Amino acid sequence: KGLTPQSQDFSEWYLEVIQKAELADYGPVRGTIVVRPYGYAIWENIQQVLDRMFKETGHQNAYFPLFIPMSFLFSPELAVVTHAGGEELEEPLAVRPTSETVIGYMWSKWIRSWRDLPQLLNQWGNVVRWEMRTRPFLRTSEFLWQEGHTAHATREEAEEEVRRMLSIYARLAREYAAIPVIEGLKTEKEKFAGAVYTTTIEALMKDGKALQAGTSHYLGENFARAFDIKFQDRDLQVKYVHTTSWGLSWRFIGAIIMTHGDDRGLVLPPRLAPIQVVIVPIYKDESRERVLEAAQGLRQALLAQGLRVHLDDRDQHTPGYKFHEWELKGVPFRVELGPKDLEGGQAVLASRLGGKETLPLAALPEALPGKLDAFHEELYRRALAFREDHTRKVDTYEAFKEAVQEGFALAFHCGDKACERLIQEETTATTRCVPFEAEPEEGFCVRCGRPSAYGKRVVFAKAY
Amino acid sequence: KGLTPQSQDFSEWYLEVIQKAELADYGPVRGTIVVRPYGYAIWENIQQVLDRMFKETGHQNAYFPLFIPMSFLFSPELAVVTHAGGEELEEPLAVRPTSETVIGYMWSKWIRSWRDLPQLLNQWGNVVRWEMRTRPFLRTSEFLWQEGHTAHATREEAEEEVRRMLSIYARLAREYAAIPVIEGLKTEKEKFAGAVYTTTIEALMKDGKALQAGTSHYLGENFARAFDIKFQDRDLQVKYVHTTSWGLSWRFIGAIIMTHGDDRGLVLPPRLAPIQVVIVPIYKDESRERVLEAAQGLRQALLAQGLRVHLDDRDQHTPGYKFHEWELKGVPFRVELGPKDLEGGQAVLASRLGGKETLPLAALPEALPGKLDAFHEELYRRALAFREDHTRKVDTYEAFKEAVQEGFALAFHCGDKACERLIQEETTATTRCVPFEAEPEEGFCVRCGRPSAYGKRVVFAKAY
Ligand code: PRO
Ligand code: PRO
Numbered sequence: 001k002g003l004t005p006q007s008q009d010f011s012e013w014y015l016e017v018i019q020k021a022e023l024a025d026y027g028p029v030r031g032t033i034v035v036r037p038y039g040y041a042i043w044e045n046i047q048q049v050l051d052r053m054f055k056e057t058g059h060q061n062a063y064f065p066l067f068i069p070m071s072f073l074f075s076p077e078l079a080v081v082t083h084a085g086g087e088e089l090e091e092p093l094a095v096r097p098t099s100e101t102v103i104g105y106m107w108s109k110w111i112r113s114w115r116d117l118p119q120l121l122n123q124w125g126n127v128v129r130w131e132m133r134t135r136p137f138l139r140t141s142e143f144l145w146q147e148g149h150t151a152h153a154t155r156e157e158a159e160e161e162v163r164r165m166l167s168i169y170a171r172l173a174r175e176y177a178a179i180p181v182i183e184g185l186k187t188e189k190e191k192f193a194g195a196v197y198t199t200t201i202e203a204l205m206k207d208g209k210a211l212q213a214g215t216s217h218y219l220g221e222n223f224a225r226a227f228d229i230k231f232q233d234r235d236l237q238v239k240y241v242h243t244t245s246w247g248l249s250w251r252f253i254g255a256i257i258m259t260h261g262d263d264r265g266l267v268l269p270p271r272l273a274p275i276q277v278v279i280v281p282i283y284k285d286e287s288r289e290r291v292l293e294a295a296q297g298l299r300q301a302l303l304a305q306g307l308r309v310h311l312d313d314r315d316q317h318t319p320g321y322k323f324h325e326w327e328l329k330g331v332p333f334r335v336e337l338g339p340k341d342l343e344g345g346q347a348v349l350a351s352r353l354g355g356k357e358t359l360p361l362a363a364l365p366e367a368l369p370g371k372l373d374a375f376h377e378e379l380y381r382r383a384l385a386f387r388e389d390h391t392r393k394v395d396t397y398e399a400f401k402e403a404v405q406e407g408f409a410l411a412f413h414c415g416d417k418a419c420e421r422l423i424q425e426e427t428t429a430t431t432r433c434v435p436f437e438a439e440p441e442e443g444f445c446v447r448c449g450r451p452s453a454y455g456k457r458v459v460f461a462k463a464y
Numbered sequence: 465k466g467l468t469p470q471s472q473d474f475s476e477w478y479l480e481v482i483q484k485a486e487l488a489d490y491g492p493v494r495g496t497i498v499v500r501p502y503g504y505a506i507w508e509n510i511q512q513v514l515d516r517m518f519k520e521t522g523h524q525n526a527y528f529p530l531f532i533p534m535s536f537l538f539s540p541e542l543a544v545v546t547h548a549g550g551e552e553l554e555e556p557l558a559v560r561p562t563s564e565t566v567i568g569y570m571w572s573k574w575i576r577s578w579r580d581l582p583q584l585l586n587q588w589g590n591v592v593r594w595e596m597r598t599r600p601f602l603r604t605s606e607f608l609w610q611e612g613h614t615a616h617a618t619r620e621e622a623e624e625e626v627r628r629m630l631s632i633y634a635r636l637a638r639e640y641a642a643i644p645v646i647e648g649l650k651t652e653k654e655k656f657a658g659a660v661y662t663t664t665i666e667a668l669m670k671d672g673k674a675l676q677a678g679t680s681h682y683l684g685e686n687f688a689r690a691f692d693i694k695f696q697d698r699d700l701q702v703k704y705v706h707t708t709s710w711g712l713s714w715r716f717i718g719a720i721i722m723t724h725g726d727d728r729g730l731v732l733p734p735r736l737a738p739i740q741v742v743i744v745p746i747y748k749d750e751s752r753e754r755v756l757e758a759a760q761g762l763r764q765a766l767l768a769q770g771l772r773v774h775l776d777d778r779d780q781h782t783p784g785y786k787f788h789e790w791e792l793k794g795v796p797f798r799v800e801l802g803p804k805d806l807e808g809g810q811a812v813l814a815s816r817l818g819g820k821e822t823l824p825l826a827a828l829p830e831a832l833p834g835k836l837d838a839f840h841e842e843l844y845r846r847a848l849a850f851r852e853d854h855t856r857k858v859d860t861y862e863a864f865k866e867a868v869q870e871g872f873a874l875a876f877h878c879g880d881k882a883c884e885r886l887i888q889e890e891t892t893a894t895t896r897c898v899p900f901e902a903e904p905e906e907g908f909c910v911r912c913g914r915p916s917a918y919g920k921r922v923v924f925a926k927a928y
C-alpha cells in the first residue's frame with residue numbers, strides 16, 4: 001500500500017513521506033522530533049552552501065548561550081526552566097526562541113568604537129518555540145536553524161546587509177533547491193517583533209499554500225537602544241549601532257519536500273541531494289565479480305567527476321526493493337548495471353522524474369554532470385509552471401476567496417492592520433509580501449474598498 | 465595589565481589569555497559563556513577533523529531531542545523546564561545532560577532484527593550539566609560537544625568500536641593538537657555511570673594537572689535491557705544489543721590552551737589553527753597599491769598550497785595592534801610585508817615559537833608547508849619532554865604526595881574504591897587511568913599497603 005496521494009490528503013501525504021523516506025521520526029516528548037541520518041544529510045548540505053555564502057560575505061560563526069534571562073524578554077512559545085542545580089532559580093530562564101537579546105547584551109560590552117564595526121556574526125544551532133501539533137520540519141517545539149546577527153555604524157550599511165542576506169537565501173532557494181520564490185517586505189502586521197521592517201522570500205507549495213523560506217530584518221537601532229549598544233564614531237561622537245537579523249531553519253527542508261515531491265515520494269534537487277546517483281548492481285554469482293568491478297569503477301569515475309554517488313552494494317535486498325527505496329528517497333538518478341547491458345559496455349540510467357535509457361558506461365561520467373543540471377533545471381521549470389498556474393490577480397473579494405483556494409492572490413490592500421486582520425479572520429489567508437519587483441499599480445482595497453497602499457498589488461495566500 | 469605569567473598564577477593566566485585572545489566571554493547567566501568567532505573557529509576545525517574520521521569509519525550524523533522525559537533519568541546536574549506553552553507542565557522535562565536514553569528509546573523501536581545492525585550514529589550539539597562556578601571550556605553549565613552512540617549484535621563488535629573511537633580521539637590529540645595522551649581504563653570509581661567500563665585519553669597540562677581529552681565507553685547491554693532494545697538474530701533467537709558511547713567536548717580547546725600556551729598568549733597547533741599564516745600589510749599612502757597587490761598575491765600563493773592564510777588589512781586597527789593580536793591569538797606564522805622589503809621582493813616571516821627572518825616572497829609558498837610541519841613536531845616534542853619531566857614512579861605515599869604536586873604519579877593501588885577515595889580526600893589527587901600499554905608490575909598499594917591490582921602501576925594526578 002503506497003503513500004496517501006497528495007491530492008487525497010496532502011497533509012497525511014507529507015507525514016507519510018517523511019516517515020517512509022526516513023527523514024525523521026517522533027521523539028518521546030510530544031512536539032519533538034529526531035532527524036534521521038538521511039534527513040540530517042540534507043540539512044548538512046544546506047549548512048555547507050549557506051556557510052560558504054556567509055563566509056564569502058565576511059561573516060563569522062560563533063556561539064551564544066542556550067538560556068536567556070527572562071528579564072531580556074510566561075509567553076506561550078517559551079519553554080521555561082525554573083529549577084536548576086537542584087535548587088529553584090531566583091529568576092527563571094527561557095530556552096532561547098531567538099538570540100538577539102543575549103547577543104545585544106554581549107555587543108553592549110564588546111562594542112566601544114567604530115573600530116569594533118561592523119559586527120558580522122552567524123550562529124548554527126537550535127531554538128525553542130513551543131508547538132503542540134508535531135509536524136516534522138514545519139511544526140516542532142525544537143528545531144535547528146541558522147541565525148545571523150550584525151551590527152553596523154550607519155543605517156545604509158545595515159539595510160544593504162539585510163538585502164544581501166535575503167538574496168543569499170533566494171539564491172539557495174533557486175539555484176540549489178530549484179524552488180522559485182518571491183522577494184519582498186512583510187506588512188506591518190506580518191513583520192518580526194522588534195524590527196523596523198522584515199524582508200522575506202515566499203514560496204508556493206504543491207498544495208497551493210505559501211511558505212516563508214527565509215527571512216532578513218532591519219532592526220534599526222531598536223535593540224541597540226534597548227540593550228544600550230553604542231559606539232564612539234570617528235567624529236568622536238557617541239552613537240547607537242544599527243543591527244540586522246536573518247534566519248533560515250530546517251523548515252527549508254519541508255519546502256523541498258512539498259515543492260518537488262510526488263505520489264511516489266521525495267524528489268531531491270541535485271545540488272542539495274545527499275545522493276546524486278545511486279548505483280544498484282544486478283548480477284548472479286557468475287557475473288558478480290565482473291559487475292561489482294565495473295560498478296565500483298563507475299563509482300570511482302563518478303566521484304572523480306565530483307558527483308555524490310552511492311553504490312548500494314547491499315547483498316540482502318532485491319534490486320526492486322533498492323530501486324523503490326531510492327525512488328522513495330528521491331535520488332535524482334539511478335544506474336542499474338547488469339550482466340547483459342555491461343557486456344556491450346552500457347547500462348541503464350533511470351531518472352527519478354521518469355524514464356530510462358541504456359547508455360555506454362564510459363559516457364555516464366561525462367554525461368551525468370550535465371544531466372543532473374538538466375534534472376535541476378526541469379524541477380525549477382515545473383515549479384515555475386505550477387506557480388504561474390496558481391497565481392491570479394483579483395479585483396473583488398469574491399475572486400480573492402476563489403484565488404486563495406488555489407494559490408497566490410494578487411490583491412490591492414489599503415494597508416490598515418484591522419482590514420488585513422479581517423481578511424485573515426474571514427478567509428484565513430494572510431499577506432505574504434509586498435514584492436520588491438512588481439508592476440506599479442493603484443486601486444482599491446479588495447476587502448474594504450478604500451484606496452490602496454504600497455503602490456502595487458500585495459501577494460496573498462493561505463500559508464504554512 | 466599584561467598576561468599574568470604562568471609561573472605566577474596559572475589560573476589567572478588562563479582566564480586572562482582566554483579573554484585577551486578573544487576566545488570567549490561570560491554570558492548574562494552564571495556558569496554560561498559565549499564562544500567568540502576566533503574561539504569557535506577552533507571548534508569548527510575540530511568538528512571537521514573528527515567528522516572525517518567518524519565518516520571513514522562508517523558513522524552517520526543525526527539529531528535527537530534537546531528535551532528528555534524526566535522518567536528516563538531533580539538531580540543538581542539537571543536544568544529542568546517546568547513551564548511551556550503558557551501553562552505548567554504535568555511532566556517537567558530535562559534539558560539533556562547526555563543523549564543515552566532518548567537514543568535508546570528510539571533504538572527500541574527502530575531495531576527489530578540483525579538487519580538493523582550495526583547502528584553507527586554521531587550527534588554534534590550541546591548538552592547541559594549545571595555548574596556553579598564558571599571557567600571557560602572547563603566548567604560551564606552548557607557546552608558544545610560530539611556524542612557518538614552505536615548499537616551492535618555481538619559484544620566483540622562493541623568493544624572494538626570502543627577502542628576504535630578512543631584511538632580516533634587519541635589521533636586527534638597527537639597528530640592534530642600535538643598533545644601527547646595516555647590511552648587506558650578508568651577505574652571502577654571513575655567510570656561512566658551506566659557503563660561496563662570507560663576508556664580514556666589523559667593529558668598533562670603545563671601546570672602539572674591532568675585533563676581528560678575524550679572518552680569511549682562499553683555499555684554492554686545495560687541500556688539495551690533498560691530501554692528494551694532487542695533484535696531477532698540470524699539464528700531466529702531474540703537477543704539484546706550491545707551499545708557503546710563516546711564523547712569529546714570543547715574542553716579539548718582548554719587542553720590546547722593549557723598545553724602549548726606561554727606567557728605571551730596562545731600557541732595553536734598548525735593542523736587545528738583557524739589561521740596558520742597571517743599577513744599584516746604595512747604601507748603608506750604612496751605605497752598602498754604596491755604592498756596590497758603583493759600581499760594578496762602571496763595570499764593566493766599560500767591558498768594554492770592548501771594552507772589556511774589570512775590577510776589582515778583592517779582599517780580599524782594599526783599594525784602594532786595587529787601583530788600583538790595575532791601573537792596573543794597564537795597564529796603559527798606571521799608575515800610582515802612592508803614597502804622597503806617589497807622593493808627587494810622580501811618580507812619578514814616571524815614564528816610564534818620565536819624567530820624572524822627577511823625572506824623573498826617567492827620562497828614562502830614552497831617553504832611554509834614544511835615549516836608548519838616542523839612547528840607541529842616541535843610543539844609535540846616539548847610537550848612530550850614536559851610530561852617526561854613531570855611523571856614519577858612512586859613506592860611511598862610520601863613520594864606520592866610530592867609527585868602529584870608536579871604532575872603524574874605512577875603508583876600501585878589495591879583497587880579498593882574506599883582506598884582510592886581516601887587518597888583523593890587526602891591529596892585531592894585522582895586515578896587518571898590504568899594504561900593499556902605499560903610495564904607489567906606487581907607491588908603494594910601506595911596508600912594501604914595491600915597487594916596491587918591491575919597488574920601494573922596506575923596513573924595518578926591532580927586533575928581538571
Ligand atoms: O527569528 C527571526 O526571524 C530572526 C532572524 C533570525 C534570528 N531571529
Ligand atoms: O557523557 C559521556 O561520557 C558519554 C559519551 C558521550 C555521550 N555520553
Ligand SMILES: [Zn+2]
Binds near residue numbers: 413420445447449
Ligand atoms: Zn482595506
Ligand SMILES: [Zn+2]
Binds near residue numbers: 878912
Ligand atoms: Zn589501597
